[PDB]
Amino acid sequence: LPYMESVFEEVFKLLECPHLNVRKAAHEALGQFCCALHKACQSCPSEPNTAALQAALARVVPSYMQAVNRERERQVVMAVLEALTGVLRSCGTLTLKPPGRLAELCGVLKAVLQRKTACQAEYDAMLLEHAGEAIPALAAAAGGDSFAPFFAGFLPLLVCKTKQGCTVAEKSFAVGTLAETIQGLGAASAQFVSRLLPVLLSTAQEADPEVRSNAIFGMGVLAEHGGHPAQEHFPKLLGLLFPLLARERHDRVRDNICGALARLLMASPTRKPEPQVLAALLHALPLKEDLEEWVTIGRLFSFLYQSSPDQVIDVAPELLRICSLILADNKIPPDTKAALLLLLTFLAKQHTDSFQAALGSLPVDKAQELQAVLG
C-alpha cells in the first residue's frame, strides 16, 4: 500500500500532459490500479485499506467524469469509458456512494450517447459503443431500483441500434447490452418487460447466430428477472422457443435456448414443466458453445429435484446420458455435476427399474463407469 499511493500520485501527473496517448494510458492505468486495489482490499478487509481505496475512487472517478465532457480527443474519452466501465464492474457500489454520483455518471453517459459532449467517424461508433457498454455495469452497481428512471431514457437510444437495417455488430452489441442490463436491473426490470419483449422477439427472428444467441439469452434473463409482468407472456415465449430446438442448427443458439428454457421453467411458478419441453431441453443438452450456461442448467437440475420428481423419472435416459459424458469434461462446474448426480442418485435409490432401463443403451464401459461412483 505505501508503494501504491506513490503510483496513484505519479500516474495522476500525466493528465496535465499535452500528449494524447499519455493521458490515455494514464486513465487506463488509474482504472486498473483502482480495480487491483479493490481486489486487494478483498483479501484482507483492513478498514484502512477500504478507506484508502475510497480515497482513490473519489479522485479517479471525478477525473473520468471531468475528462468525458471536456477532453477534446475522442480516443482519450474512449479510453476513459473503458476504464470507468472496469471500475463500475469491479468496485460497483463503492463508486456510487457519494450522493448524486449515479445521476452524474448517467448524465455523462447520456452526453456521449446523443453526441452532446465536448469531444463531439469510427471513433463515433466506438464512443457510442463504449458509453453503451457502461449501462449494464452501472445498472448492476446501483441496483436497478436506483437506476431504472435513467434506463427509461437510455432504452430508446439503445433500441435504435436494433431496428432492421443496422450492422449485425450494431444490432447484436446493442441487444446483448440490453440482456446484460436486464440482469443488472434485477427486479426493477419488471417495469420494462412490455417495451423489451418485442425487441427480443424480433431480434431472434434474425439470421446471424450472434444476434439470435444474444436475443434468446435476453428472453431467458427477462423471464427470470421480469417477475409478474414477464410471467404473462411465458406461453408466448415458450411458443416461439419450442420450435427452434429442432428447427435450428447453430450450436451456440442451441445452448442459449436451453438456458432460456431453464430460466423459464425455473421462474414459472404454477404446476410442473411441460413434459415435451423438458424432454426437448434435455435432448439438446449437453452444451457445446456458450458453456457459461451450465451453471444455469445445474440450477435447473436442482430445481427439478425440489419441485417435481414424478417427472424426472421419464427423462432418465436423457438424464444419465448427459452424465456419462460430462464428468470426463473437467471444464464443467462441479456443482452442476453435483446437481445432475443428485437427480441420478434419486432415480437410482428410489426408482430403480427406470434407472436400469436408462443404463440400457449407454456403452457398456460407460454403464460400468456410471456405476463406479454411485452404488
Here the cell at position 280 is 426437448
Task: Fill in the DSSP letter of residue 285.
Answer: P
DSSP 287-299: P-S-GGGHHHHHH
Distance CA 110, CA 76 (A): 18
Contact 185, 192 (CB under 8 A): yes
Measured from the Cβ of residue 345, the count of other Cβ atoms closer than 10 Å reads 14
Cβ neighbour number for residue 57 with a 10 Å cutoff:
21
| Burial of 32 per CB tally in 10 Å (0-12, 13-18, 19+) | middle
8 A C-beta contact, residue 130 and residue 171: no
Q: Are 172 and 178 in contact (CB under 8 A)?
A: no
SS3 69: coil
Q: Which amino acid is at 151?
A: F
SS3 115: coil
Angle (deg, nearest 10), helices 122-142 and 101-113: 160
| Cβ-contact 55, 37 below 8 angstroms | no
**Is the separation of the CB atoms in 308 and 273 below 8 Å?**
yes
Between the two ends of the chain, the Cα-to-Cα distance in Å is 54
Domain that holds residue 186: 1-375
* Residues whose CB falls within 8 Å of the CB of residue 223, separated by 6 or more in sequence, listed in order: 230, 234, 237, 260, 263, 264, 267, 268
Q: How far is CA 302 from CA 211, 280, 331, 346, in A?
A: 30, 18, 20, 11
d(CA 264, CA 267): 5
If one counts the domains in the chain, the total is: 1
Torsion angle of C-alpha atoms 129, 130, 134, 137, degrees rounded to 10 = 90
Angle at 299 between CA 274 and CA 90, to 5 degrees: 135
Residue 223's φ and ψ, nearest 5 degrees, are -60, -45
